[PDB]
Amino acid sequence: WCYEIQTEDPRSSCLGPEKWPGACKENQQSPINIVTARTKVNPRLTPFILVGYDQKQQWPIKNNQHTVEMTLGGGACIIGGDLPARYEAVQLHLHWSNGNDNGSEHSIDGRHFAMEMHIVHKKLKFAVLAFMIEVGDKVNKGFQPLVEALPSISKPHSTSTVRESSLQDMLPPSTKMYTYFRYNGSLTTPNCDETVIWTVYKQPIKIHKNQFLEFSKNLYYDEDQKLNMKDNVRPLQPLGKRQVFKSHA
Amino acid sequence: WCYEIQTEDPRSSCLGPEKWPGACKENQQSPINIVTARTKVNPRLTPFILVGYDQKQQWPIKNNQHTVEMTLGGGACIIGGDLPARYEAVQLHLHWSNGNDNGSEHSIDGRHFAMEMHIVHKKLKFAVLAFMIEVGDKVNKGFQPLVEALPSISKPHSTSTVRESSLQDMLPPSTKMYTYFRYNGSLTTPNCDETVIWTVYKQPIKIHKNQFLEFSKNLYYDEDQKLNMKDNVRPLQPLGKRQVFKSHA
Ligand SMILES: [Zn+2]
Ligand SMILES: [Zn+2]
């Protein structure tokens, strides 16, 4: 399987998003488009309890042929937030594109952002905290460790390490983590298992244009390093019957 | 009203703890002694949601004639933790003594620590988060801002400001804020209103001996600066009928 952009090469054809196996063709899929005015409020959607996000560590990263995957291994976890149980933070990655728009998978009122960061949590089924990233005129110190380590994982399957930093510094301030949307869905990559509880935050994280451009300039999809990594996003999926909730009243 | 140590001067007598007015003589009072083995577990006592503790600020402090009071004004608040509603963080202060023991008001299994920090929250009746402080061989950077500003509030009613810092850096890591004790009680200073929900944490905060000694060496109880501030603790109160809960099973 590969993203649309990967099937543009005359030779070496492979399965585009429209031809993905597994549960990819099912009913409840992700991403989705959030229509703010149609969301129902649910009081129970109170801010999450972040355990271990304040711990600085050396995070092992790698180019997994689809994105930059940063392994967390349970050094942190989330409790509460109307979740069924406690979830251990397993990994983190991002989806991005060419410009300031049409780079995020989900969209809030038809608007796409520059990138989208996904924090996957394994039920101690999947709790994925999705954040939108916007490009700004200010350097975001919290994203510096990741940016600096990209030049090392240029080649697919490369492995490296990010200097001492915490998950907290990458996320927006806690006073901005009040408003979010919640809905049942699935992974946005094969086999697209429909066992995910999504939490997409309203407030985006802001990084500088140069930190942004650094991703596609350094990462590659293939061994020969001919295709720079970008447009690694899956197109919007139909809402179907499910409802999308908002933490706010 | 004044603490025991203040009634030792031959002249100028005033109301010691045993002669405090208001609700001070009532049934449900604080501090108390926590007997770990007699505490009942309550699942609902999950970690608190800290809102705004990660925000660095210039905190206005003052010697309020009884301790160092650091005003927070609601820049932060707590939600959850089986509390009835959301509580706004109003102020912070400490109680201390002469040595590594017998300096904390509460005690865990008859053991007292060097100091005790109180974070008061106004119901948006009172939610007070109490932390024990232990003296160690390592400098605690998070406590540096407060220590440096003590030399300024030496005189009673003095006012000053603490350099940019956050409430978070003073508290122990989140992975250590799982275990705590909860019980109904009151303020430990007149008028001793019995409208407090206490949360005393098991894991103490560690500061250097020199940061410790800095408190009594700099603060004074009186205008003429004759009595250094220490032993500003109230003696243990009888448990009575109420039960003390533990977050852990
Ligand atoms: Zn993803
Ligand atoms: Zn107190």
This structure's resolution (angstroms)? Answer: 2.8
State whether residue A136 is helix, strand or coil. Answer: strand
Is A7 marked as a binding-site residue?
no
* B179 at A interface, C-beta within 8 A: no
Tokens 């999926």 belong to which residue? A237
Residues A161, A62: Cα–Cα separation, whole Å: 8
Peptide bond preceding B31 in cis form (omega within 30 of 0): yes
Which phi and psi angles does B86 have, rounded to 5°? Answer: -90, 140
Among A130, A126, A124, A175, smallest CA distance to A34 is for A130
Domain count, chain B: 1
| Structural element, H or E, at residue A59 | strand A57-63
Instruction: Tell me the shortest Cα–Cα distance from A176 to chain B, in angstroms.
Output: 9
β pairing state of A115-123 and A180-185: unpaired
A69, A60 in Cβ contact below 8 A?
no
Which phi and psi angles does B156 have, rounded to 5°? Answer: -55, 140
State whether residue A239 is helix, strand or coil. Answer: coil
Number of the ligand closest to the Cα of B117 = 2
Residue A129: give its domain's CATH number.
3.10.200.10
Cβ pair A168:B51 closer than 8 A: no
Among B53, B169, B54, smallest CA distance to A142 is for B54
State whether residue B147 is helix, strand or coil. Answer: helix
- What method did the depositors use to determine the structure? X-ray
State whether residue A40 is helix, strand or coil. Answer: strand
* A46 at B interface, C-beta within 8 A: yes
β pairing state of A40-41 and A245-246: parallel
Is B157 marked as a binding-site residue?
no
Residues of B in contact with A48 (CB under 8 A): 49
A36, A200 in Cβ contact below 8 A?
no
B77, B66 in Cβ contact below 8 A?
no
Residues A9, A234: Cα–Cα separation, whole Å: 18
A33, A110 in Cβ contact below 8 A?
yes
Cβ pair B49:A52 closer than 8 A: no
State whether residue A146 is helix, strand or coil. Answer: helix
* A179 at B interface, C-beta within 8 A: no
Ligand 1 centroid, distance to A187 Cα (angstroms): 7
Residues A158, A152: Cα–Cα separation, whole Å: 7
Q: Which residues contact A60 (CB under 8 A, 6 or more apart)?
A: A70, A71, A159, A160, A161, A162
Residues B84, A186: Cα–Cα separation, whole Å: 35
State whether residue A147 is helix, strand or coil. Answer: helix
Cα separation values, A195 from A22, A117, A186, B175, Å: 13, 19, 6, 28
β pairing state of A68-71 and A180-185: unpaired
Cα separation values, B109 from A136, A156, A216, B6, Å: 54, 57, 59, 28
Residues A229, A233: Cα–Cα separation, whole Å: 11
* A48 at B interface, C-beta within 8 A: yes
Residues of A in contact with B49 (CB under 8 A): 46-49, 80
Cβ pair A46:B79 closer than 8 A: yes
Task: Name the DSSP letter for residue B235.
Answer: P
Task: Name the DSSP letter for residue B23.
Answer: G
Residues of B in contact with A50 (CB under 8 A): 174
Can you give the residue range of the structural domain that contains B154? 1-249
